[PDB]
Amino acid sequence: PHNAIFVNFEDEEVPKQPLEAAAQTWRRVCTNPVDRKVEEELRKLFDIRPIWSRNAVKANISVHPDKLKVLLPFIAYYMITGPWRSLWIRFGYDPRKNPDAKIYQVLDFRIRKYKLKDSVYIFREGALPPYRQMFYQLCDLNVEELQKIIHRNDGAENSCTERDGWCLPKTSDELRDTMSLMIRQTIRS
């Protein structure tokens, strides 16, 4: 598609290098020095945080979308199934072999110049998700209770499953109910 590798949760190995088509496409698109600058910036940010969401990345650098859709498959690979679905992972990083990746797992919450804001990917007591269906990452839930629910099983993550990953079972529903309660609390205030 965009010269990206799509990894399933049941795939044995994860890619350790991009595709040569993606490398040549980036070589073609990289025209101004600002492109090299933003490439280095994205590389450093994926070095600090190995797993990223597109909206979270857009909230950290101001890049042109047509440049980002080419740069991302060159730096990271895309997850299709599993606890880290719809997330970009640095080449050579396997979340199914790192318990710390628990803090990078995804959570789908449905209600019932180029840089973006913080509310597009960060949850806080007193704010309101800007969209009807969001894909948060467990590290960006800046609440003490949600983080306690997340780290309840720290140091003894047992096995990595598809429904919950390194987290304890039925954790996602617990976080979802807590965020709904906090949303109603913020609405009342």
UniProtKB/Swiss-Prot annotation:
Subunit structure: Part of the TFIIIC subcomplex TFIIIC2, consisting of six subunits, GTF3C1, GTF3C2, GTF3C3, GTF3C4, GTF3C5 and GTF3C6. Interacts with BRF1, GTF3C6 and TBP.
Record keywords, A-Z: Acetylation, DNA-binding, Nucleus, Transcription
Phylogenetic placement of the source organism: Eukaryota, Metazoa, Chordata, Craniata, Vertebrata
Role this protein plays: Involved in RNA polymerase III-mediated transcription. Integral, tightly associated component of the DNA-binding TFIIIC2 subcomplex that directly binds tRNA and virus-associated RNA promoters.
Record's subcellular location: Nucleus
Chain segments annotated as coiled-coil in the UniProt record: none
Top-level taxon: Eukaryota
Protein species of origin: Homo sapiens (Human)
Protein name (record): General transcription factor 3C polypeptide 5
GO molecular function, one term: DNA binding
